[PDB]
Each structure stands twice: as C-alpha cells, then as structure tokens.
Scaffold this motif. Sequence first.
Motif, PDB file in Angstrom:
ATOM      1  N   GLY B 106       0.801  -1.208   0.000  1.00  0.00           N
ATOM      2  CA  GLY B 106       0.000   0.000   0.000  1.00  0.00           C
ATOM      3  C   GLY B 106       0.839   1.265   0.000  1.00  0.00           C
ATOM      4  O   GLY B 106       0.440   2.278  -0.577  1.00  0.00           O
ATOM      5  N   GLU B 191       3.101  -5.567   3.695  1.00  0.00           N
ATOM      6  CA  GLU B 191       3.061  -4.220   4.243  1.00  0.00           C
ATOM      7  C   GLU B 191       3.886  -4.177   5.518  1.00  0.00           C
ATOM      8  O   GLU B 191       3.747  -5.044   6.383  1.00  0.00           O
ATOM      9  CB  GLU B 191       1.619  -3.827   4.570  1.00  0.00           C
ATOM     10  N   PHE B 392      -8.951   3.627   0.020  1.00  0.00           N
ATOM     11  CA  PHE B 392      -9.126   5.046  -0.232  1.00  0.00           C
ATOM     12  C   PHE B 392      -9.112   5.285  -1.729  1.00  0.00           C
ATOM     13  O   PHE B 392      -8.540   4.497  -2.481  1.00  0.00           O
ATOM     14  CB  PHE B 392      -8.006   5.855   0.422  1.00  0.00           C
TER      15      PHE B 392
HETATM   16  C1  LIG Z   1      -6.932   1.688   3.011  1.00  0.00           C
HETATM   17  O1  LIG Z   1      -7.506   1.966   1.942  1.00  0.00           O
HETATM   18  C2  LIG Z   1      -6.415   2.845   3.845  1.00  0.00           C
HETATM   19  C3  LIG Z   1      -5.260   3.559   3.171  1.00  0.00           C
HETATM   20  C4  LIG Z   1      -4.085   2.614   2.959  1.00  0.00           C
HETATM   21  C5  LIG Z   1      -3.025   3.235   2.071  1.00  0.00           C
HETATM   22  C6  LIG Z   1      -1.889   2.259   1.813  1.00  0.00           C
HETATM   23  C7  LIG Z   1      -0.954   2.134   3.011  1.00  0.00           C
HETATM   24  C8  LIG Z   1       0.158   3.179   2.976  1.00  0.00           C
HETATM   25  C9  LIG Z   1      -0.367   4.595   3.143  1.00  0.00           C
HETATM   26  C10 LIG Z   1       0.718   5.635   2.878  1.00  0.00           C
HETATM   27  C11 LIG Z   1       1.904   5.475   3.808  1.00  0.00           C
HETATM   28  C12 LIG Z   1       3.014   6.467   3.549  1.00  0.00           C
END
Ligand SMILES: *C(=O)CCCCCCCCCCC
Lengths: 405, 405
Positions: B106, B191, B392
């Motif tokens: 992500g 992740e 998102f």
């Molecule tokens: C799920 O949709 C919530 C948002 C997750 C985004 C991916 C994870 C990393 C986010 C950005 C980190 C720097």
Amino acid sequence: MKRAVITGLGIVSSIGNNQQEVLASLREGRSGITFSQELKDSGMRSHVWGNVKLDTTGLIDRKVVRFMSDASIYAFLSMEQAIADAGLSPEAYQNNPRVGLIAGSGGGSPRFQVFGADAMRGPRGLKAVGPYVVTKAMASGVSACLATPFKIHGVNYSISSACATSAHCIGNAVEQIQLGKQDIVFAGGGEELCWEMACEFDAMGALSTKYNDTPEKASRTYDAHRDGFVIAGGGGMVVVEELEHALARGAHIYAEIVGYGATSDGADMVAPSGEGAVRCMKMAMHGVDTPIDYLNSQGTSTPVGDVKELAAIREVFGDKSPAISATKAMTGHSLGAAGVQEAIYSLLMLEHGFIAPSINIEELDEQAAGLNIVTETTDRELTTVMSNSFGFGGTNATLVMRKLK
Amino acid sequence: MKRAVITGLGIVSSIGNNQQEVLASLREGRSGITFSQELKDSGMRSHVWGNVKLDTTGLIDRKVVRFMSDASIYAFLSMEQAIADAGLSPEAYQNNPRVGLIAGSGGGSPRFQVFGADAMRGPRGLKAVGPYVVTKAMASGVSACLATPFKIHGVNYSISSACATSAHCIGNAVEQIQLGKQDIVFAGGGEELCWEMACEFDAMGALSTKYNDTPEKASRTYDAHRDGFVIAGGGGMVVVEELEHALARGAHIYAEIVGYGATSDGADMVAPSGEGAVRCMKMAMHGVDTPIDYLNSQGTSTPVGDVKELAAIREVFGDKSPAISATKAMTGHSLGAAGVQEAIYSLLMLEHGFIAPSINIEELDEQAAGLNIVTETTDRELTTVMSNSFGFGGTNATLVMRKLK
Ligand SMILES: *C(=O)CCCCCCCCCCC
Ligand SMILES: *C(=O)CCCCCCCCCCC
Ligand SMILES: [N+]
Ligand SMILES: [N+]
C-alpha cells in the motif's frame, strides 16, 4: 479479440505543458534540463533535473487538490488535457461502469512521507501532520486522486513497476479492453521531483554529476562520456479506447496499440539483463508484420544501461535495425511517468511524421556502431513505432503503436 | 477462456507465521493485537497494532535481503511457503516465460524513505544513505524484490490500490491466466508496520485510540463501541494457476477463482460510497450458479465504514444473506496485504470447513439487523466464499472462490 486505440493524450513534462509545446521541443531538440539549487543545497552531487516549468497553484479545485501530491497533480492536469483531446463530455465518461482508470507513480510521494514523519517528531505531533498525508503518500495516490474527482466508476488502481510503471499501466488498460471489461480506460502516471527521492538515486551513483555547469548537456544517451541519468518529474495520460466505441462517436484516433510486452529478468535488482528486454520486444511484436519505423528507447544515459539496451535491440532486429532516438537526452528521466510521456512523444512523431533527435552525442559509443541513431530532426512518414520501458527489479515493458488507415 | 485456480499459499500475519499457525488462531478466535511501545513513543494516540511475531533474522540470504524493506521480507517469506505448499521446484517455475509475479504494497516503505531523508540530512549525506534505499522505498518493492531472486521471467509488477492492493493483484493474476499469457502467477503482497506510516492514519482519526489498555479488544468490527481500525503488518502470497496445467501435474487445488470484481466509487477520497461496493460484488457474483456460503467482509471496525458495507451487502443479497465475519477483529488491518491474507483466511475456512468468528462484538450495531454475523467458530460445509476489499480513492475489489467440482 477487441482492438485498443489511443484517442486522446495529455502531458505535463520538462519540455512542455501540453502536446503543442512538447511537439515544438521535440522538433527543435530542446532540452528541458536546468540547474537545481534544491538538489545542490540537499548535499547531492547531481545538481540538474528536468523540472515542470509551471505553477499549478489554483489549477485544481481546493477541496480536490488538498488530498494530492505532485505526482497526482501532474497526472490530473494531464488527464484534463486527454479528456478534452478525446472530446469526451462529462456525460460520456463519468459515472460509467465501462470507463476506468489505471495510472500510477514510481515512488508515491517521498516528500509527504518525510513531511509526516518530520511533523510527527515536532512539538505539534499529530496536529502538524494533518489528515491529508495518507492520500498524498500512498502508492496508489495517482489513481485514487483522479478516479474520485473524475467520477470514474470502472476499474481503478495503480500499477507500479519503477521506471516501467506508466508503460504497464497503458498495457493493462489494453488488456481491460481486450477482455471486454471496459470501453475506455485512462492510462498514464505522474512523478514528483524532489531531493527527498533524488538523493536516494545519487547515493546509488545512478545520476549524472560531472555536467552540473552545463545542465542541458548532462543527459547524453549513447555518448561516450555519459555518467548517469538526469532525474525529472511530470505526468502523462492517454485515452485507451475500444475501436468500435471510438469509431462510433467519431473520435480522432492517433494509433492502435498493436503490441504490448511485459516480462521479467529474474537476474539483477538494479542492472538490466538484456535477455528480458529481448523477450519483451519480441512479445510486443507478435503478430505485427509491419516494420518498426521508429523505436523510442529507454536510453537513460547510463554507462551500462545504454549498452545493454542496444544489445537487446540488435538481437531482436538484427539487420532490420529501425531508426532510434532517446528522448531522455532532452527530457531527463521521469521515472514512473516516463512510460506514458515517451509513448506520447512517439505518438506525436507518428502523428506529425518526424523523428525527434537523440541529442548531446558528441562521441558515439563504440558499442553503438552499426545502428541507426537519429541525431537530427528528420521528417518521415512513420507507420509503426515502438517504445521500451525498463525498471529496477528487472521489470520490462514494450508498447508498439501503429497508424490506422 | 482459461480457468484459474489456487494451488498453493503462504502467509505471515499477526495471528500466525504460516498457514498452520493462522488456522489455529482462526479456529480459536485468537487476537494478534498487542501493545506497541514504538507507537506510544512516537506520540500517537493509538498504541496497539497487529505485529508479526517472527525473528526474520537470517531467513533470507544477505545478498538478497539487503535490497528489501519489511513489506518485501514478509512477501518473500510468504512466497517461499507458497512455492513449497504448491509442490513446485526451481526447474518448474524458474526462468520460465510462462510464470510471473504480481504483488504489491500500500505504501512501499515509509520507514526507509524517512531513513534516507534523515541520513541524507546528516553530516555524512550520501554515504549515510547507502545504495540500497531505492529498492526498499519504491512502490514496486514487493514485486521487484521477489521476481529477481526467484528468477521469474514472466509478468512482473505491483498493483497498488490502498487497502485493496493485494486483492487486485490476485485478480490481475487471474486475468493473465484467462488471457492465456501465463500458466502460473504468484500473487499477493506485503506491508511493513512502523510509526512512520501509522502516524499518518492516526492524524486522520482512523485508528482506534480508546482501547490501548486492552489491546485485544481494540479491533471490534460491528461493535457499537468501535472507534477506528488497528493497523497491522505482514504478507501473503497465493499461487494462481491455469486449470489444465494444475490438473496435469496433479497439484493440490484449494479452489477456483470464479469471480473477480473491480470497480470505482468516483465519490469520496476516504469514505466508501457503498454504491461502488454493490457493483463490485455483483460483478464478482455474475455467472456463479452457486450461492455465497461465507463472506469475509472488509470490516475495518470504523463507525461509518462498517455501516456502509453492511448496507451494501444488504443491498446485494437482502433476505438471503450469507454468513459474515470480519477477521480484522482479531488480525487488525494489514492494509496492502489485507487482500491476500483475507483471501487466504477464506480459503482456509473453505478448505477446513469452518467459519472464523467476528470477535469483540459486545453490542451488535443496529445497522447489522437482518444479517448473519457469525460471532463463534462454526463448523460448516462451505462451497463458495467471497472476500471484499475497499481502499481510499474509492477503489473496490471482490474475489469469489469455490471448490472445484
Ligand atoms: C486503506 O484503503 C487505507 C489507506 C491505505 C493506504 C496504503 C498504506 C500506505 C499509506 C501511505 C503510507 C506512507
Ligand atoms: C527506474 O527503474 C529506477 C527506479 C525508479 C523507482 C521509482 C522511484 C521510487 C523512489 C522511492 C524512494 C527512493
Ligand atoms: N521509451
Ligand atoms: N476481506
């Protein structure tokens, strides 16, 4: 199966903020590289970059841009252009399950990732971070920030593959059309330009550092004295559309994507094997019986990289060596956005009948002897063009585009 | 078109370092959430997380792990498990143009991105940064770091789509099989878990902050007292293979992917529209002559999120609602890795004939009235299961897996 064609394009690059400005730069062999005080002040050895010459302030609704990083801004503006160029009205592409978007970036947003961590460690903590860092820093920022405002209801995600990123995005879009899942897919990408990301490449010794006094000469693909690529930022977007759908609405077709290759080296993490690139080009040329009139190489201006790619090209075409030019010599390397921008430069050459020059070649590398490297703008009726994109992790992408009768 | 089946899996999560440990945790509804001093020390309000309880020291060759971030490490270990579980050996999947990999994260690696910037700003600059940050921080890190050492020659890239990331990877792998381009595609993701990234979510008010005293009760999907999700890290990988190819080698087939949905909300940047989820599930259910026996919802344990999904499910099924369970109640939200891990939890439920319980539900939300929310490990003869993933940017993904006839 279904055929996929490009009906619109949009671009924000170091050599132009629209296809007209870009067209002019390509014909003139104009460099988009400049000296960067930011890179110098950061402690880097490379003090040059292909920057977007444009203040994006106020070009996007405040409630929309508040969630976006530069990669997304560049892609967003590119998509606006592409939509207009394709003549797509809101009712034609918005809230439509058969209209999707596939676009990404190479590193999301190092600037906002560092921003969040820096603010979090300050006296304000969470309050300094704010609630917009996630959408700016996440890897899918480019797709998320565009799909939402443009009311996209179809496919929506980003493909990431380092410097092949936007090339795979375009190829995946073709696949959606071939699978009959979408009639239109906006494909492309964007990449921010910042010392936060650039220093990591300098630490690898991948960036040019011996030409800081003459920025426009730092990027010199195939030149015997090349010393690394020049980092750049920007965006690009193209409208990938099913042929029947495009014809029905009387859309302007630039070309059909008749070949898409995607392979893996399974060898080195940061150096191209060449063997993977050979298979990639051969895959893209399967069923393509027309000759390649022009090939826009990856040509990053790196000692080893330029050599490996020329070897692969020789293995693929042998005696059928097509005209070749490396646009990165004047644009710099936009990483995640390179794939779509180079496809766009290739489409412009095909549309306007000319081959952009491979500049800064004062002394052609010995390993490029028997090849047709174009070093001066040449007018010519092109019909089929190829553009290669390679990235770290041994990821390869090749796109072949051909004019329609 | 060709049919795609899962012939192997691997996983490293907060509730188990392999499918056996995971299976054990799911049957007992054990929580993988613990107190995090790191998150507390960073100044965050959320002090709990779903950490991977495993000492990865020396599990990967020095020459290989030096280019990897935690997301890549988790995915790498999961792939090793998947290869073995699939019964595949080097001679069969290595240096094979018909074998590829599609795995992503992500957010690449906020930790190494912040490390690079911090180091660069130090007195040593580039020397302190080192030459390995790019492959650790780039978005395509997970695919690049695996395809290279595993000698993959086929497709190779990452698909990022926030919390739907690994779900789209699996779906894309399926498309490759349906297109006849690949016989096998390893799909999944990983992740990392760190304050660098976590604080960005806390700054959004999306993380649970009222149960720091009782970690295992923080994630409580569908509970009227939920207050945000619990962030987690980990990896997952499944072997997606063409049906005839799998039967031909006598592979163990967990299930067939009979449905894959991918849509876009085109509405809000961070809040689900529900309308998109409805279309995504229906798309995945299209053509499936068997009813959904179990549904592994997204259930992030958020006030609005949980309610929106339930409404969507209610809209899709209505009275004939399938068994529902939110495993994030015990595992936490692994973001980019959520998709593949949840697909795995579902395959384990389908393989072992049981339904994992939705724990921490002290007071069922009023929105979950006419829905069968299983809150206790129940033995059931499942045939078809569904897993939802939303992220998102309004990105939706749905996978439907079913036992092979
Ligand atoms: C799920 O949709 C919530 C948002 C997750 C985004 C991916 C994870 C990393 C986010 C950005 C980190 C720097
Ligand atoms: C092209 O293949 C070279 C690698 C580009 C990857 C995209 C940029 C990622 C930067 C992440 C922070 C160091
Ligand atoms: N290219
Ligand atoms: N899920």
